[PDB]
Amino acid sequence: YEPQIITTDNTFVSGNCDVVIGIVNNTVYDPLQLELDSFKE
Amino acid sequence: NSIAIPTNFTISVTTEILPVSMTKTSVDCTMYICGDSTECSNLLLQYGSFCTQLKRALTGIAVEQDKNTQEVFAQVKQIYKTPPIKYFGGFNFSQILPDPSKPSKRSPIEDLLFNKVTLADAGFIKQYGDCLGDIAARCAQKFNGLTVLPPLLTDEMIAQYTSALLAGTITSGWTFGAGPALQIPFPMQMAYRFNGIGVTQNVLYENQKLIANQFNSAIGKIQDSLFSTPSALGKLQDVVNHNAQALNTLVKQLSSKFGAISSVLNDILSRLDPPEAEVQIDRLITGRLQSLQTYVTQQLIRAAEIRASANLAATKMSECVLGQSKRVDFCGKGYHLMSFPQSAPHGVVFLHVTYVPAQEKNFTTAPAICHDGKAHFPREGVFVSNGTHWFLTQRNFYEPQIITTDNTFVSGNCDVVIGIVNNTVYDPLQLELDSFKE
Amino acid sequence: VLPPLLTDEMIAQYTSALLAGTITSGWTFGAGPALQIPFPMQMAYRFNGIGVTQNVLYENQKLIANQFNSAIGKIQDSLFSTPSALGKLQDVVNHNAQALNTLVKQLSSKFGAISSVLNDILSRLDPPEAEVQIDRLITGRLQSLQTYVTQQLIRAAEIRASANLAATKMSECVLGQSKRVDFCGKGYHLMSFPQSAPHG
Amino acid sequence: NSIAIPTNFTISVTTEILPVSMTKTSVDCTMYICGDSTECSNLLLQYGSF
Amino acid sequence: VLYQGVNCTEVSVAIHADQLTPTWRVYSTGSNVFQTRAGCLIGAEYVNNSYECDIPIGAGICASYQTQTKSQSIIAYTMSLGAENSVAYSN
Ligand SMILES: *[C@@H]1O[C@H](CO)[C@@H](O[C@@H]2O[C@H](CO)[C@@H](O[C@@H]3O[C@H](CO)[C@@H](O)[C@H](O)[C@@H]3O)[C@H](O)[C@H]2NC(C)=O)[C@H](O)[C@H]1NC(C)=O
Ligand SMILES: *[C@@H]1O[C@H](CO)[C@@H](O[C@@H]2O[C@H](CO)[C@@H](O[C@@H]3O[C@H](CO)[C@@H](O)[C@H](O)[C@@H]3O)[C@H](O)[C@H]2NC(C)=O)[C@H](O)[C@H]1NC(C)=O
Ligand SMILES: *[C@@H]1O[C@H](CO)[C@@H](O[C@@H]2O[C@H](CO)[C@@H](O)[C@H](O)[C@H]2NC(C)=O)[C@H](O)[C@H]1NC(C)=O
Ligand SMILES: *[C@@H]1O[C@H](CO)[C@@H](O[C@@H]2O[C@H](CO)[C@@H](O)[C@H](O)[C@H]2NC(C)=O)[C@H](O)[C@H]1NC(C)=O
Ligand SMILES: *[C@@H]1O[C@H](CO)[C@@H](O[C@@H]2O[C@H](CO)[C@@H](O)[C@H](O)[C@H]2NC(C)=O)[C@H](O)[C@H]1NC(C)=O
Ligand SMILES: *[C@@H]1O[C@H](CO)[C@@H](O)[C@H](O)[C@H]1NC(C)=O
Ligand SMILES: *[C@@H]1O[C@H](CO)[C@@H](O)[C@H](O)[C@H]1NC(C)=O
Ligand SMILES: *[C@@H]1O[C@H](CO)[C@@H](O)[C@H](O)[C@H]1NC(C)=O
Ligand SMILES: *[C@@H]1O[C@H](CO)[C@@H](O)[C@H](O)[C@H]1NC(C)=O
Ligand SMILES: *[C@@H]1O[C@H](CO)[C@@H](O)[C@H](O)[C@H]1NC(C)=O
């Protein structure tokens, strides 16, 4: 056990959310977008 | 430049039948050679430690057969049970899990496996049969000194070990084999088993219902195949038949004369005075020792063969049931995913659950993609083309994806790779960088 | 002596099928339908499997092909040069030949009898003694057959263990890429090729 | 803090030789023991199923 | 003493008739004679409590030397296979 933040580097994307049984809603933190908003401001 | 890649898959369940134990026999040396005859026994003493050796050999065999059964089945330190809900993502295990409504708590498949195999030795308190009918011949019927010892573990205890192994595998995957059992939803156990064979977990989730239905169909097919085919349980019936044949021959040898005036020891003692009876008895003793030594030699050889089989069965249970083996064809044909044990008389049946690629299509391929003078190689999978566009796909299931910096790595100039094909490699980050300010 | 069920031509056909399958389709040959793959990409996969990045093969593809071809030539020369290279199979043949020659040789032994020939015993002696002398020859010859069969059962068990090992190695080394150290030769395993040999 | 890393490699081919089968034999006990001798065969009959 | 393959009733009859070839006799009391599938076991008290197997007898029955009540004696029991473990499986 070693919890990490769920990000777009730790996960991969395949398909929509309707087909997977038991899918849950959560935030996935993209590094690039965050840096974009820190760089901009 | 052509590669074939499966666009579909089949869930295949196969059976493997292995002997684990041999019928445990015991021979009363004095009863067989010199039954209720003091003079014959006294003559037998002149041959030394004959009986003292066969008894050890047969005891060693009997102990070895109980050791073989424990090595194959006593691989778990706790008895695991399934939850009362028994819902596992749509995977139906009712044909392999214990049926509570029947005595002995055997699964339907185990019940068929036990009903199909005919046991000639039928170890029990044989005096219960008594008489009142023609003798069964089950093969001395005890009376000639040949008896059968029961196993240490009863069929119910073996079924309980099988149930514990099944509950552990179903509810915790391989974490129970290595250490404490850790609960996991069955579909995630399947997702990790998909990863074991090089197939991304998402393949399971989009096709979870298809996979569960193919699994249930395969289990039903196994149930029907085992029921329908008479000579399905060949190896176990062959072991039973060889032991029965050995005992039938050993008992039938008592009727031989070996040069004596009569095969019946009481007739020799009745007809002749000691000095002639001793010669006729010595002839019968010599023949009886030859018969017993031959029987024991073959039983030792068969015991070694059964030991090798039991060791293979234990290895398979450890590597196929308590984990996901990567050995090709060790745990059935196809890519090994998992297995389920079932008890059978004198042996074990493994149900091996594997995938068979299906509906392959052949695409054009390339060792690498050349972009701005750099050779791009896939991190995982291979490059394919449908004739107009290049994609990166996982090797064991067709799933095209756009070729990107994150999917590939760069090593060297395009000039070194013999088969490199010119194509665009898309560059994430740069695209959005532009959009940000431009 | 009974012939094998599969003749040398059928064994050669199985070996050829195994070679064509492995060369054309790699590790898929034994799992499901054969899937063609270019051989350099099969080797690239195998290199990635041992832990060497697939770019090593492509950058050094000609060197690797030359080393492979040289190694195969060296194998043929090694088998040609060394008389003992195939000793295991010659030993199996010699042991069966020795066992059969031993059984035939035992027919000339007296085993305590006055003569090794049954017709001489019957001609020269009266029935009463002749039955004893014949019983001695029968005892000796029956012991010779029992010894032969026991030795053949032991040898058969040894051959069965060897055959099971060979089948396991073919299924794990030829139909796939094994990670078992020293199971499929010394070094990091890439692949294997079967060849038929008499009795092995 | 010292590690050795290979900078080159060799492709090696080795041979492993395994027996698979042995010569299949069959024995006629009467001819072997009793070479067409009727008296020998009749005596042999008293040894049963050997 | 285990009388392999013999019914305990036959053993008791043979003992009362002094027909058994061995001349020694095992002390017989109520609950000291237990019928197993392997045979008749005389000289061990059968208990309901299941334990790990120590001295195997057969057909699930194993004997051991254990303290009862206050007093160590030989007992016979049905083998325990192991501790139970219910896995908290859920979706
Ligand atoms: C898991 O699978 C088992 C079978 O492998 C399912 O039990 C089966 O349930 C169906 C329900 O319709 C039974 O059908 C019945 O068949 C009899 C045949 O005479 C018929 O008369 C009835 O009207 C009905 O059509 C089927 O027999 C039964 N099979 C067994 C062996 O019990 C079970 O329901 C499945 N569980 C889940 C959760 O999917
Ligand atoms: C890694 O090792 C391999 C050998 O295992 C090296 O390849 C070998 O390189 C030598 C040159 O140093 C080659 O020798 C030359 O062969 C030609 C043949 O015509 C000859 O004309 C030259 O005079 C010289 O003798 C050798 O053949 C070659 N081996 C093979 C199989 O091609 C390789 O260079 C090594 N790489 C590194 C980075 O160390
Ligand atoms: C997970 O989040 C999605 C998106 O917010 C949810 O989908 C919405 O569900 C509401 C009702 O619950 C609808 O009115 C919206 O139109 C849906 N939008 C989309 C894009 O699907 C989904 O229901 C959430 N699931 C759970 C279990 O909370
Ligand atoms: C190869 O695959 C690409 C990607 O799907 C195909 O191009 C797409 O085709 C769909 C229709 O199936 C269109 O909706 C997309 O807009 C197309 N995208 C592009 C970039 O062309 C292409 O047609 C396929 N070619 C063959 C021969 O199968
Ligand atoms: C891939 O693209 C490169 C660059 O666009 C091509 O390189 C040219 O190759 C031709 C011969 O086919 C030479 O005459 C040019 O001088 C090369 N130019 C450069 C900048 O390298 C390469 O040929 C292309 N390969 C394929 C297969 O189309
Ligand atoms: C794969 O095959 C199954 C039948 O075995 C079929 O139901 C399914 O639709 C197929 N999937 C695709 C993508 O062709
Ligand atoms: C022993 O004999 C009695 C005789 O009444 C019988 O009832 C009992 O079932 C027998 N038990 C066994 C194990 O043979
Ligand atoms: C695909 O395989 C079939 C097999 O007969 C062959 O005829 C066809 O030409 C192949 N196509 C490609 C693009 O390799
Ligand atoms: C075990 O418990 C049952 C409960 O009904 C009892 O009848 C039986 O005699 C007990 N056995 C022993 C050996 O105490
Ligand atoms: C798992 O999902 C099924 C869906 O039918 C449901 O019936 C079952 O109760 C769920 N399990 C738990 C523990 O809630």
Residue numbers in the entry:
A (entry chain A): 1110 to 1150
B (entry chain B): 710 to 847, 851 to 1150
C (entry chain C): 860 to 1059
D (entry chain C): 710 to 759
E (entry chain A): 610 to 679, 689 to 709
Can I see the authors' text?
In addition, to dissect how the mutations S31Δ, F456L, and Q493E affect the overall spike stability, we introduced these mutations into the JN.1.11 spike protein. Additionally, we also determined apo spike protein structures of engineered JN.1-derived mutants carrying S31Δ, F456L, and Q493E. Our results demonstrated that S31Δ indeed induces a fully glycan-occupied N30 glycosylation site in all of the variants carrying the S31 deletion, including JN.1.11 + S31Δ, JN.1.11.1 + S31Δ, JN.1.11 + Q493E + S31Δ, and KP.3.1.1. Similarly, JN.1.11 + S31Δ, JN.1.11.1 + S31Δ, and JN.1.11 + Q493E + S31Δ also shared similar NTD structures with KP.3.1.1. Using 3D variability analysis, we quantified the particle proportion for each conformational state and found that S31Δ did not affect the proportions of “one RBD up” and “all RBD down” particles by comparing the proportion of JN.1.11 and other spike proteins that have S31Δ. The data from three paired variant sets (JN.1.11 & JN.1.11 + S31Δ, JN.1.11.1 & JN.1.11.1 + S31Δ, and JN.1.11 + Q493E & JN.1.11 + Q493E + S31Δ) showed that S31Δ has little impact on hACE2 binding, which is consistent with previous studies. Besides, while F456L alone did not affect hACE2 binding (JN.1.11.1 has F456L compared to JN.1.11), Q493E alone substantially reduced binding affinity, which is also consistent with prior research and is likely due to the electrostatic repulsion between hACE2-E35 and RBD-E49317. RBD-Q493E alone in the presence of F456 would likely be disfavored due to an electrostatic repulsion with hACE2-E35. Q493E alone reduced hACE2 binding, while F456L by itself had minimal impact on the binding; however, hACE2 binding with the Q493E mutation was recovered in the context of F456L (JN.1.11 + S31Δ+Q493E vs. KP.3.1.1). In addition, other spike mutants with Q493E retain BD55-1205 binding, while F456L resulted in a binding affinity decrease where the only mutation of JN.1.11.1 is F456L compared to JN.1.11.
The JN.1-sublineage KP.3.1.1 recently emerged as the globally prevalent SARS-CoV-2 variant, demonstrating increased infectivity and antibody escape. We investigate how mutations and a deletion in the KP.3.1.1 spike protein (S) affect hACE2 binding and antibody escape. To investigate the effects of N30 glycosylation introduced by S31Δ and two RBD mutations (F456L and Q493E) on the structure and function of the spike protein, we determined the cryo-EM structures of the recent SARS-CoV-2 variants KP.3.1.1 and JN.1.11 along with engineered variants JN.1.11 + S31Δ+Q493E, JN.1.11.1 + S31Δ, and JN.1.11 + S31Δ. The spike proteins exhibited three conformational states: “one RBD up,” “all RBD down,” and “flexible” (i.e., one or two RBDs disordered in the density maps due to flexibility).
